[PDB]
């Protein structure tokens, strides 16, 4: 059927979570066991379960792998997710990924040369599906669906505390204000930017599995005139950690 | 293509029954090409289930029933490929012995080794397909 | 907490919506390294994997005529290739893969259902594998008749 | 227990007040004399929190996450119709998941929170009572709810 010699499977493992294996022999229907290999070489026999009968997941062949979003892979499921997302990361330093509509962003730790002013003209005025993956692509996004429909945005950030939402809220912000012809005085960034600290120390905490984590909800407003320039930024609090 | 002389030189025992087993051989020495599959289906198309040999009037009706699909089994006479896209005529050796040996009814290792004695084979590694399929029915 | 809320909710649904999920991969602050344990967990209780289980369902998998016909041209008989290509892609198609509720055909893309491409690349592996057997039966009847 | 309990309440009341005082002014070093035309918001927020003990905090995290999801769904769902009626496709051909009966499992009348509110007015109530009360009400009359 699809269980042939030489297709490859995933097989759940303590170390990896899910560990590739390739079928040594034809799965025949009824079989109560497969035949695999492992990372060293050709080792075990694969017990399937009695009460399901069910089969492990099968890997995608690797003309679809390493791609910009993780819709165009036709076995879709946990581990193929898990090994794109892996190959891109650590074989080619990407850190950004589409699933759909959603941007993913895996922490580097390490500084990237990705966020200068030669990569900001570059994503100014493109399309989001015609660029590689990055938060400057959903911050042009943001500001032209602006003014095409008469109609204020929201980029929503989120993940656990220490992910990097608010380093991603920096960068879009660096974004908006360097397309839009530039406040004199106000210089907007800056002043949000300096406004973290003190929100860090009413709203953060320490907590069990976390040294900073937020206990609320921050919503900043950024302000556009009829010209569409920045002028000035607002404020929103929500569910606070009473 | 019928033929009791045929049966009668795998009839060895001269009991009147060859074994189910040497229906493929017995089909493949009066002409015919066929499958182990096609070979396999034309026997699990008859209750000869429990058979385990084949009367001569057996094999008659077997090929009989079956004489469209045999006899599609020696119509041709030229074979391409599919490997090749290039449409350089070579492939490489290591192609050659996958596709005889891990593709369909999978030769062994052997039999291939036998059909690549006096083959040449460049310095890139590929060998002349046309010369080596003329080479293997021709002769 | 359900006023909040609410409050937030009404804020964020006179606007258009845009998504970023934020991925730890290490809990060490390590550069580059990636923990399979850790990442599982952080894509589980961000929602990617279940908004992922639904797109499945649907026709997840998108290609445009041009494409198909490039990686599947030797999958066609020679004659049913057309002076259009988008026509000989249809022709192709229903005539791979048989049920006609897995792939639906559009304006400039051909949308498919799940696992269907991987049978795609299947079927031009079998192909292949299809075609060994025609050869090896011709010469094993050779072969026959010489001994 | 009763003047300890407004102690609290006390504490929590001057605490809101005043790290809303601290936005107030915070937003008018931020404020612009010009008049705003529009606006681009970035909402900064958590995900799903699971931990090894979850207690009210989690369950107030997780239940903000399921009415986020929830726009997320729709959104997804109205840009699905819209690439769908590019393409010419049919768009009666994706099913929706509605996530709606959990938001109603904490959010309505009779519901885990009203349940909690209801309880935490008795003169007598605990939260033993309170877990019986959830049984009593949900268990095996939803398939939201375990045990």
Redesign the interface.
């Known amino acids: 059927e699809?269980y042939?010699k030489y297709a490859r499977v995933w097989i759940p493992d303590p170390e990896?979570?899910?560990k590739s294996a390739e079928l040594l022999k034809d799965y025949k229907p009824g079989d109560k066991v497969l035949q695999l290999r492992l990372e060293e070489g050709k080792d075990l026999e694969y017990c399937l379960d009695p009460k399901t009968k069910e089969l492990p997941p099968?890997r995608?062949?690797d003309?679809?792998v390493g791609e910009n979003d993780?819709?165009?892979?036709?076995?879709?499921?946990?581990p193929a997710?898990?090994h794109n997302?892996?190959v891109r990361?650590?074989d080619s330093?990407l850190i950004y990924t589409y699933?759909?509509?959603?941007?993913?962003?895996?922490?580097?730790?390490?500084q990237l040369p990705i966020y200068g002013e030669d990569i900001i003209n570059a994503y100014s005025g493109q399309n989001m599906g015609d660029m590689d993956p990055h938060?400057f692509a959903?911050a042009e996004?943001?500001y032209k669906?602006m003014a095409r429909?008469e109609?204020?945005?929201?980029?929503?950030?989120?993940?656990?505390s220490?992910?990097?939402?608010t380093v991603?809220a920096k960068y879009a912000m660096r974004y908006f204000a360097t397309v839009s012809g530039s406040a004199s005085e106000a210089n907007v960034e800056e002043k949000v930017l300096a406004s973290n600290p003190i929100m860090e120390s009413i709203g953060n905490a320490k907590t069990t599995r976390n040294d900073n984590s937020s206990r609320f909800?921050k919503?900043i407003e950024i302000g556009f005139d009829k010209r569409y320039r920045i002028i000035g930024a607002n404020m929103?609090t929500?569910?606070?950690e009473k | 293509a019928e033929f009791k002389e045929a049966f009668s030189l795998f009839d060895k025992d001269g009991d009147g029954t060859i074994t189910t087993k040497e229906l493929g051989?017995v089909m493949?020495?009066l002409?015919?090409?066929?499958?182990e599959?096609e070979l396999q289906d034309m026997i699990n198309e008859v209750d000869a289930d429990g058979n385990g040999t084949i009367d001569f009037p057996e094999f008659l009706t077997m090929m009989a029933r079956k004489m469209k699909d045999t006899d599609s089994?020696?119509e041709?006479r030229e074979?391409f490929?599919?490997?090749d896209?290039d449409g350089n005529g070579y492939i490489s050796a290591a192609e050659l012995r996958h596709?005889?040996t891990?593709?369909?009814?999978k030769?062994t290792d052997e039999e291939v080794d036998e059909?690549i004695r006096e083959a040449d084979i460049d310095g890139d590694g590929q060998v002349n397909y046309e010369e080596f399929?003329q080479m293997?029915?021709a002769? | 907490?359900?006023n909040?809320?609410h409050?937030?909710?009404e804020?964020?649904?006179?606007?258009?919506?845009?998504?970023?999920?934020?991925?730890?991969?290490?809990d060490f602050?390590?550069?580059?390294?990636?923990d399979?344990?850790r990442?599982?967990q952080?894509?589980?209780?961000?929602?990617?994997?279940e908004?992922?289980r639904?797109?499945?369902?649907?026709?997840?998998?998108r290609w445009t005529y041009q494409e198909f016909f490039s990686?599947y041209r030797?999958l066609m008989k020679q004659k049913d290739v057309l002076s259009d290509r988008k026509q000989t892609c249809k022709n192709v198609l229903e005539k791979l893969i048989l049920d006609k509720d897995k792939y639906?055909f559009?304006?400039?893309?051909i949308?498919?259902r799940?696992?269907?491409?991987?049978?795609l690349?299947?079927i031009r592996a079998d192909?292949?594998?299809?075609?060994?057997?025609?050869?090896?039966?011709?010469?094993?009847?050779?072969l026959?008749?010489?001994k | 227990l009763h003047a300890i309990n407004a102690r609290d309440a006390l504490a929590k009341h001057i605490y809101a007040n005043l790290f809303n005082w601290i936005v107030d002014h915070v937003n008018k070093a931020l404020h612009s004399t010009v008049k705003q035309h529009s606006f681009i918001?970035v909402?900064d927020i958590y995900?799903?929190?699971?931990f090894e003990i979850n207690s009210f905090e989690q369950f107030?995290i997780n239940?903000?996450?399921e009415?986020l999801?929830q726009?997320?769904?729709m959104?997804?769902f109205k840009l699905?119709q819209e690439e769908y009626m590019?393409?010419?496709?049919?768009w009666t051909?994706?099913?929706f998941?509605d996530n709606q009966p959990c938001i109603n499992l904490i959010?309505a009348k009779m519901g885990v929170?009203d349940l909690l509110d209801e309880e935490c007015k008795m003169p007598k109530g605990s939260d033993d009572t309170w877990a019986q009360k959830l049984y009593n009400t949900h268990l095996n009359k939803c398939a939201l709810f375990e045990k």
Not at chain 1, 70 to 78: P, Q, R, V
Not at chain 1, 162 to 165: L, P
Not at chain 3, 54 to 61: D, L
Not at chain 4, 47 to 50: D, I, L, P, Y
């Open positions: 699809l042939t990896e979570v899910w099968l995608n062949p003309i679809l993780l819709t165009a892979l036709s076995y879709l499921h946990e997710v898990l997302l892996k990361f650590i330093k699933c759909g509509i959603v941007l993913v962003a895996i922490n580097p730790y390490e938060i959903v996004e943001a669906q429909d109609r204020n945005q929201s980029i929503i950030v989120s993940g656990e220490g992910a990097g939402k991603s909800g919503y929103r929500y569910l606070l | 051989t493949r020495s002409g015919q090409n066929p499958t599959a089994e020696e041709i074979a490929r599919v490997f896209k596709v005889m891990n593709l369909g009814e030769l059909m399929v293997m029915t002769k | 907490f359900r909040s809320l409050l937030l909710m804020t964020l649904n006179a606007t258009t919506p845009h998504y970023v999920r934020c991925i730890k991969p290490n602050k390590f550069p580059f390294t990636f399979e344990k990442a599982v952080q894509l589980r209780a961000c929602g990617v994997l908004t992922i639904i797109s499945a369902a649907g026709f997840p998998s990686r030797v639906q559009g304006k400039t893309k949308f498919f799940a696992g269907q491409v991987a049978y690349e299947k192909k292949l594998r299809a075609a060994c057997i025609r050869i090896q039966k011709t010469i094993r009847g050779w026959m008749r010489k | 918001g909402l995900g799903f929190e699971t107030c239940y903000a996450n009415k999801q726009q997320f769904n959104h997804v699905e590019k393409e010419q496709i049919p051909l994706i099913d998941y959010e929170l």
